C-alpha cells in the first residue's frame, strides 16, 4: 500500500467542504453520477474507433447500491476507467486549477452545489462519507483500489479484490448521521431531481 499527499489546494478543499456548514449534502450524488457519465461517454466515444476497447464489457450502465449492514452507499459504473497515473498524478494536476478557481467563487458569493462546475465535484463525497474508497479499472493497467478519509493523505494499492472488467466503483462509507442516502425512496427522490436525463441506465439496488 502506498500513501500520497494531496496536493495542499486539495487538501484545503476537503477540509472546506468537511467543516463549512451546507445542509443541501445531497448534491454529491449528482456530481458522482455525472463523473460516471463522463466515463462513460468516453468509453463508448473511443470505441468507436477501436470496438475492442469493450472486449472488457459491452454494457454501459450504472448501478447505485446501498448496504445498511456495511453503511455504505456504492455507485458502480462501466466506463472507461482512470490508470495509476490518473488516480496518483494526472487527474490532481488538473483538480489543483478548479478547487483555486472554485475557492474564489464561493469567496465571491457561489455556493458548495455549484462544484461541479469547476471539475473537482467527486469531492463533494465527503460531504456524506467519512471515507471513501474508489475502485478502478482501466484497459491496459491493472485493478487499482484508491482510498481516503481525508487529513491530507491518500492511499493506492493494486486490487486484488473481486474483478470489474473495466469502469470505476466509488464506495461511500457514511458518516453515522448520513445514513438517508442508504433509503430507496430517498436515492430515488435525488436521482429524479438531480439525475434524470443521464444517458445510461440507472439501477437502484435494494436491499435484502
Ligand atoms: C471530472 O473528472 C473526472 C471524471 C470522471 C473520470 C473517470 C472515472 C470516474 C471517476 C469518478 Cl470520481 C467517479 O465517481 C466515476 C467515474 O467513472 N472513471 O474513469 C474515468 N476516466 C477518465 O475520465 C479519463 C478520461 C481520465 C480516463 C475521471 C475524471
Known amino acids: 500500500v ?9 487538501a484545503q478543499l476537503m477540509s472546506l467542504i468537511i467543516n463549512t456548514f ?3 449534502k445531497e448534491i454529491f450524488l449528482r456530481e458522482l453520477i455525472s463523473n ?23 454494457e454501459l450502465h450504472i448501478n447505485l447500491i446501498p448496504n445498511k449492514q456495511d453503511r455504505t452507499l456504492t455507485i458502480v459504473d462501466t466506463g472507461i476507467g482512470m490508470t495509476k497515473a490518473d488516480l496518483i498524478n494526472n487527474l490532481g494536476t488538473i ?12 469567496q465571491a458569493g457561489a455556493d458548495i452545489s455549484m462544484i461541479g462546475q ?3 465535484g ?15 479499472k482501466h484497459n491496459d493497467d491493472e485493478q487499482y483500489a484508491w482510498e481516503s478519509s481525508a487529513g491530507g493523505s491518500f492511499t493506492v494499492r493494486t486490487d ?6 473495466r469502469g470505476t466503483k466509488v464506495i461511500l462509507h457514511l458518516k453515522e448521521d448520513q445514513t438517508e442516502y442508504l433509503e430507496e425512496r430517498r436515492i430515488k427522490e435525488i436521482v429524479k431531481k438531480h439525475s ?5 441506465p440507472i439501477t437502484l439496488f435494494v436491499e435484502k
Not at 502506498?2 to 486539495?10: D, G
Not at 460516471?36 to 459491452?58: F, H, Q, V, W
Not at 486484488?160 to 472488467?165: A, V
Not at 434524470?196 to 445510461?200: A, P, V
Open 2 to 10: 502506498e500513501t500520497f499527499a494531496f496536493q495542499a489546494e486539495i
Open 22 to 24: 451546507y445542509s443541501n
Open 36 to 58: 460516471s457519465s463522463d466515463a462513460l461517454d468516453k468509453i463508448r466515444y473511443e470505441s468507436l474507433t477501436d470496438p475492442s476497447k469493450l472486449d472488457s464489457g459491452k
Open 95 to 106: 483538480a489543483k486549477s478548479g478547487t483555486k478557481a472554485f475557492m474564489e467563487a464561493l
Open 118 to 120: 469547476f471539475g473537482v
Open 122 to 136: 467527486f469531492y463533494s463525497a465527503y460531504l456524506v462519507a467519512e471515507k471513501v474508497t474508489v475502485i478502478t
Open 160 to 165: 486484488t479484490g473481486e474483478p470489474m472488467g
Open 196 to 200: 434524470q436525463f443521464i444517458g445510461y
